[PDB]
Amino acid sequence: MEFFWTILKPNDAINFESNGNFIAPEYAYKIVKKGDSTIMKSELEYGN
Amino acid sequence: GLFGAIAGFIEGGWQGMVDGWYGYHHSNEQGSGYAADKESTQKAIDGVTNKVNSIIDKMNTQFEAVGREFNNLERRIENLNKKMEDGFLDVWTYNAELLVLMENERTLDFHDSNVKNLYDKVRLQLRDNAKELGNGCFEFYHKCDNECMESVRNGTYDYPQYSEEARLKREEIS
Numbered sequence: 001m002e003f004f005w006t007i008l009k010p011n012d013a014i015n016f017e018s019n020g021n022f023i024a025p026e027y028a029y030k031i032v033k034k035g036d037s038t039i040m041k042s043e044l045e046y047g048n
Numbered sequence: 049g050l051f052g053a054i055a056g057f058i059e060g061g062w063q064g065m066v067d068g069w070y071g072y073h074h075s076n077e078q079g080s081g082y083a084a085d086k087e088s089t090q091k092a093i094d095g096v097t098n099k100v101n102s103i104i105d106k107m108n109t110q111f112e113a114v115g116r117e118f119n120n121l122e123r124r125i126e127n128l129n130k131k132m133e134d135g136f137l138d139v140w141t142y143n144a145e146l147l148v149l150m151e152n153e154r155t156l157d158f159h160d161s162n163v164k165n166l167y168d169k170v171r172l173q174l175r176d177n178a179k180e181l182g183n184g185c186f187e188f189y190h191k192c193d194n195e196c197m198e199s200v201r202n203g204t205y206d207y208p209q210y211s212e213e214a215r216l217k218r219e220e221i222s
């Protein structure tokens with residue numbers, strides 16, 4: 001399975017059309033807040 | 049010690065001097081003890097503290113490593129990113145070490161001059177009145193009170209009056 005992704009700007013439409021081998025999306029992801037973050041690699045756990 | 053004030057002339061520090069950095073030891077009829085002059089140690093404190101902040105202030109802008117990931121089919125870019133990130137760290141860790149190494153020498157040499165110049169002005173005030181022993185000691189002639197020691201300490205040593213009694217003491221030993 002080769003999954004794809006794209007960013008849908010506000011007031012824009014995305015059109016799907018297929019006759020087989022299609023994997024329709026079920027839930028979409030809103031982008032509420034944009035800030036600064038990093039995807040760090042570690043085996044540590046939460047420490048409170 | 050390029051200026052030679054530390055060791056050289058004075059090779060022994062004073063453990064009893066805790067009030068300040070630079071001071072004078074008086075051994076006269078009115079007891080003995082250690083005393084400090086503020087104009088010398090305050091400038092050293094301000095100068096060193098300014099230097100300490102300057103290292104922190106200058107190092108505010110530095111490279112900040114960030115995480116980037118690649119998909120196992122683009123390894124030239126991953127190698128390029130890896131060599132760039134650690135290359136910048138190698139450059140910046142050399143600047144920090146070199147800066148610390150040089151400024152350590154500055155502080156030690158800066159302290160040499162302050163105590164050296166402190167000695168220079170006392171010799172320049174006492175001049176013929178005292179004799180230079182070799183370890184920073186001055187042995188003056190006049191039999192004045194402890195206030196004259198304070199007069200040496202505030203850098204206000206009037207010469208003429210003390211010259212006549214001292215020159216009467218330069219002719220009795222000769």
Ligand SMILES: *[C@@H]1O[C@H](CO)[C@@H](O[C@@H]2O[C@H](CO)[C@@H](O[C@@H]3O[C@H](CO)[C@@H](O)[C@H](O)[C@@H]3O)[C@H](O)[C@H]2NC(C)=O)[C@H](O)[C@H]1NC(C)=O
Nearest residue numbers: 006007008009010011012013014015016017028029030031
């Ligand atoms: C997704 O839906 C929105 C809203 O349903 C579409 O917005 C459209 O935006 C245009 C430009 O503002 C509207 O045209 C104007 O409409 C007003 C009110 O009807 C009219 O008085 C003006 O003369 C002008 O025609 C358009 O009506 C509006 N569509 C609506 C309200 O249904 C948007 O275009 C849609 N996305 C795509 C990709 O089509």
Ligand SMILES: *[C@@H]1O[C@H](CO)[C@@H](O)[C@H](O)[C@H]1NC(C)=O
Nearest residue numbers: 195198199200201202203204
């Ligand atoms: C200390 O030196 C200053 C220099 O102006 C002088 O005014 C003051 O009288 C000195 N202290 C004493 C106790 O003489």
